[model samples]
Target: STGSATTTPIDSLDDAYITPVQIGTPAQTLNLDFDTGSSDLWVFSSETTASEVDGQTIYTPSKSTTAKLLSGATWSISYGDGSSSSGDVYTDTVSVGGLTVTGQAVESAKKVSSSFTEDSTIDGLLGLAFSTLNTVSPTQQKTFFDNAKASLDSPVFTADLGYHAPGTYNFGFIDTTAYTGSITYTAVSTKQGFWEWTSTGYAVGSGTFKSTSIDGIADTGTTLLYLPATVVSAYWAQVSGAKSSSSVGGYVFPCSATLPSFTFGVGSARIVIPGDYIDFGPISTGSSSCFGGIQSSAGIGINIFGDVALKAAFVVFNGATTPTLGFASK
Candidate 1:
C-alpha cells in the first residue's frame, strides 16, 4: 500500500497501478507489481543516485534494520514503456498484505522517479508473471507465483479488482456470491497474465453492434475499454443525445439517464456493465451540464474495457492452480 521501490519510466506507472504481490514475510516485505509484461524484482534504496532514479520510488535497504544487501551486487530493470532502474541487490524478509516469504532476492535502487523516490510510497516492483518478460539479472529468477506457492496460505490466488484507482481492485479468492446467475469459467490463457482476456463484444441498453465489436485481448494492464471507433460511436449514438454537444473530451452524462445494463461477451460467457457506473462528475465546463464519465481514445488503439468495464461483473483469476479467467455473477 505504501509504494514501489524505484520509478524507471514504467509505461504503466503513468497510471500509478501495480500488481502488488508478496515475496517474504512481514518482517521482510516485498511489494512489487508482479507484472507478466516485465519480469524483475526491484525496490528503492537510499544509495541510488538522484539522476538515474528519475520518476521512481526507491527503498533504503540499509534502514530496514533487517534488510541484507546481496553480495555487493547491483541490479537494473527496464520497462516496455521505455523506463529503467538500477541499484544494489539484497535479501530480506518480504510480505504482501498478510502473506510473507523469507530470504528473497531484490534490487534496492538509491535513485528513482522524483515523485516516487522522495516520499515513502512503496518499496518497488516484483515482476514474476513471465520470465521472457523478466528484467531481473539471471533474467529468470523465480517469479512471484513460484515463490507464492511456497508462501501463500492457500494454493489459490486471484486478482479481485472492483476498483483500483478511482475504483476497486481487490485480490484473493474468487467470491461466488457476486455472480449474478451461474458462474462461467473461461480457460486461462497463460500467454501473459492471470487476468489477460479476449473480449468478443460489448452491449449496452438494447444496443449490441456486432459489426462494431472488434476482436481484442482483454488486459488488466489497462484501465479503460478501448472500443472500436464504430463500436464507441454506436454506443454514443444510444447515449449521445444525453451527452451535451459542448461536452469536452469523454462523454459526461447524468446517472438518471436510462442506460440499460450492457453486456460484454468473452469466449463462452456474457458480462454486463451496469448503467450506474457510467456516471462520473458534473464538471463546470463553460455552460453545460455534461456528465462525469465517458471519453474518447480512438487514437489509443481499440477501446479497452478497463476497471470501468470490470465493474459490470466479478472476474476470477486462478493464478495459483490454473491461470484462468472466470466471470462472477453480478
Candidate 2:
C-alpha cells in the first residue's frame, strides 16, 4: 500500500534525479528520471533505432509475458529544450520501489533525439505530473503515481531532492523525520497539467522579502531555477562581476565571486537556499566564470522551481480531489 524509493543525482551538478523502475513481467530495470514537469512514462527500448541507442539500458517488451501492445496507440513528447522522443505503446506490469501497478502504459521509444542519446545516465522518464498531460493518442494513460494512488495508504507523494547526494521519493505517506519544522501548505492549480502554485514572495540574501505573487511550477525534471526577469536580476545584482552572457546563454559570474543565498516563501514559511548552491558550476573546464543556478524565465513563459530550489526543501504533491502542495524546511 506504500512505496519508498531512493533517487540519486546523475552527476556532481545534480543535473537530474534518477530512480530505478521495473517494467514488464520479467522485470527489466532501468534508471528513469522522475520528472514532475511532464506526463509520460516513456523508456528507451529494443524498439528504438540502433543508431539512437547509446550506453543506456533498454526495455524489451518482447521478453515480458505480460506485455500487451496497445494497438494503434502512439505517443510523442517534446521538451522546452527541443529534445524529443516518440513511439508506440504497451500495457504491462510496472513497479516502482515496492508499489506495483498492473496494465501500466509503458511507452517504448522508437526514435529519440540527440540530447537523449548523448545522456547515458538515464534510460527513460517516469512522469509524476498530472495525467492530463499524457501524450498517448485515442486515450491518455495515467501516470505510475496516478495508477497506484488508489492502492496507496495516502494519495500523495513527497520529493526530498538532495544536493549532490541521494534523496528519497516516498509514496502513500509522508516521512516526518525527513524534514524540519511543520510543513506549509499551498493551493495548487492543475489546469496546465503541472504542479503549479503561486509563491508568496522571495528575498535575496538578507534583503527585504519582495511582496509579489510569483507563479511557478515545481519541476524536478529541470536542472536550474528560473524566475521572472525582475526577480532574477535582483539576485544577480547582489553578486559582483555577474553578467547576463549571450555566449553562455545565461547569467555568468566570476567563479570566485561571493554568491548570495536565495529565499522563497511558501505561505508564511521561508525556505533559504545556501549560497554555495547558487554557484552552479564552472562555465567551462578551466574557465574562471560560472553559470548561476537561478536564471531569468522571460523566455520560458512560466517560472520553474527546479532542482536548484527543490533541493532546498522537502516537497509534497498531495493528490486529493482538491490538490495542494506542501513545503517544509530540511
Candidate 3:
C-alpha cells in the first residue's frame, strides 16, 4: 500500500511546510513541521510546563489507550537555530497520511525553548533524518520514516515544497505527474545525519558559472539558503542597492529593487533560484526593506539548501542502501 499527503505553508510564514499526523488511540491530531534536516519526532505535550505551552497544542499521552511509557527513557534536542525541546518517551500508534506504525516512539515534551514557544502554529516536529541522529537517551529511537519504511511499498519519499503555496509530500512512491522532466540523481553522504551532497558549480545572475563544488545539506526545516560568505557577497554585489545590514543581521535590499537569479549546478543541470524568491518578505511587517533569502553559512558549520532552494525543484529522499538525492524542476 502507498501513502501520500499535501504540505501547506504554516500560515503565510514561509518558514516550513506543515503536515498533520495522527498519534495515540482515538487519534489526537497534531500539526507538525516535517523537518528533513534533523531526527527525533517530538511534540509539545501535556507534560510540558503549562506556562510555556503558550498557544501551541499539547499531546496528552495519558488519554491514549495505546500509549506505553518507555521507563527511564527521555529525549532532548536542540536545533541550529537554538530551538530545543526535551521530554520522556511514549510508544504509541502513529499515523501519517495513510501509513500507520504501531508502537512508534514519540517524544512527549516537558520543556521547549523560546523559538518553539513563539511559533505556536507548529505543535511538533516529524524528523526525517537518519535514526542515528535520534536523541532518545538510554536507547535511541527510530523516526517515523524509519519505522514505516518496512511496511511501505518502496523506501522512498518525495518532497514538493512550494513557495507561498501548497505542495505535496508523497510516501512509499513517487508521483511522476507532479514534476516536469526526469529527476537528476546524486549520491549523498549521510554521515552527519543529513542529505549532504556536493554541487558541481554555482553562478550569480547572468555571470559565468564558477565550477566550485559546494558541500551542503538539503534542509526543509531551514528557511533560507545559506552559502559561503564570499559566495553570498558575490551574489548581492550584482544588485544595485544591496548590503549586509548590521541591524537585520543579513543582507537587505530595497523592496522595489529587481534581484538577480542565483543558480547552483548539479552535474550538468542547474537549479536556479529565481530573482523574486530572494525577496524573503520584509524585514519588518510595515517596512519597505526586505531581507535576502540567501545568507552566509559562516557559523552554521555547513551550507544549507533550505526552503528557498527546495522550492525551486522537486526532491526525492531516497533512503535505500546508498542514499541519493533526486532533484527535478517543478
Candidate 4:
C-alpha cells in the first residue's frame, strides 16, 4: 500500500502487527501488517504472476526456513486508492513473536494492479505505521521499527476491533489481560508517516466530557467513525431515541436503550469507547442510521474509533522510539 490507511472506526485496513525482525536468526516470524497508511513491506514472491495472485497471500519463502532475497533490487508501491504494486528486494531473516532483527528490509510484490490484482485480499504490507515510512525511494529510510529494534521483548501491543473474524486480522502483543486498571501512555505521531492522535475531550453517559471544544485524530488510514458537527448535533440532542443516519454514516440510538458512555483524552489518557460497539455496526439508511462504522467526513471530522478504539486501548506504534504513541490500559 502506498497510501490508504487513516481509518479507525472499523478500519478498512491500514494494517498492523509486526514481528519479523531477521528472517530466522534465532527463530522468529510475524509477517507484514505494519503500515503507516503506505510505506513499504510488499510480500508475495515465488515470482508471482497469477494475475497478481487475486486478493493476496504469499509467504512461502520456501516455507520460511529463514528466507532471503535482496539481489536485483526493486520494490514499488502506490495507493491512496489508485492502487499499485511492484516487487523485488529481499534480506529476510525475520521473526515477530519474540522479536529478532537482522538485515531486515523486505518487499516482494511481483506485479499487482486492477485494484490490487482484483482484491484477492493482499498478503503483503507491513509498514510499521512508519518508523520512517520508506517505500524504497527518495533515498533510503528503511523502517519497521528501524529493522526490528534489536528485538524488543517488552513493548508491542496494538489491539483494535469492534467486530473481528469478518476478515480476521489480529496479531501479537496487547492482551495484557485486556483492560481494567493502571496503564497510561501517550506520545507517538511521527509527523506524517502514520500513528496520529488528537482527541482529549468528549465524555458522555458517565458525565464530564465536552471541553477541548472538539478534536480527534487517531487514524489507522481512516476507515470510519467521524463526528464533530457540533458533536454530531450534541450527540443527537442527548438521544431521546436518537436518529439521523445520513444515508448510512453514523448516528443511532437504543441498541438496548440506556445510552451515554464516552471518553477520549490523550494527554492524561482515558479512552473508553463502548456504545454497544455503536449498536452492532449500525448502518441502516432508513429514518436515519449512519454507522456501519460511522461514515461521512464532511463536518470537518466526526468521531472515528475504528476497531472501536482498538478494543478500547492498548495501542503502541513507537516507530522505533519517539514520534510518540502509546495507550496502555487494556
Best prediction by TM-score: 2
Tens digits of per-residue lDDT for model 1, 1-330: 112122121232123345444433234333345343345677655676755554444455655665675774665665433456676677766655545556666666754555444434345666535445554454335554456564344444444344322222333444445456776666645555324455666676766535233444334444455566555565656764564344255655554455555567766567766665555434553534445333455665444455556545665545555565666646
For candidate 3, write residues 1-330 as lDDT tens digits: 567887889867577778988999999999889999988889999999887888887789999999999999999998998889998999999888888989899999999998888888899999998899999999999998988887788899989988789888888998889889888999799898899999888899888999998999988989999999999999999887889988889999888889999998887788988888778768899888888999999988999999999999999999888999999987
Tens digit of per-residue lDDT, candidate 4, span 198-297 = 6666775577766583334455443445666655555456657767665443566644454554566767667776654444433433423324333334
Candidate 2 accuracy as lDDT = 0.95
Q: In model 4, which regions exceed 4 Å deviation?
A: 1-40, 43-46, 49-89, 92-104, 109-124, 129-143, 148-202, 205-207, 210-263, 269-288, 292-330
lDDT of each: 0.51, 0.95, 0.89, 0.52
Residue-pair clashes per candidate: 75, 0, 0, 65
| Model 3 alpha-carbon miss at residue 289, Å | 1.7
- Once superposed on the true structure, which residue ranges of model 2 sit more than 4 Å away at CA? none
Q: lDDT tens digits, residues 1-330, model 2? A: 998999999999898999999998889999999999999999999999999999999999999999999999999999988999999999999988899999999999999999999999999999999999999998899999999999999999999999989999999999999999999999999999999999999999999998789999999999999999999999999999999998999999999898989999999889999988887789989999999999999988999999999999999999998999999999
Residue 4 error for model 4, in Å? 16
The 10-residue segment of model 3 with minimum total lDDT is: 10-19
Candidate with maximal lDDT: 2
Ordered list by lDDT, greatest first? 2, 3, 4, 1
Q: Which ten residues in a row have the lowest lDDT in candidate 4?
A: 1-10
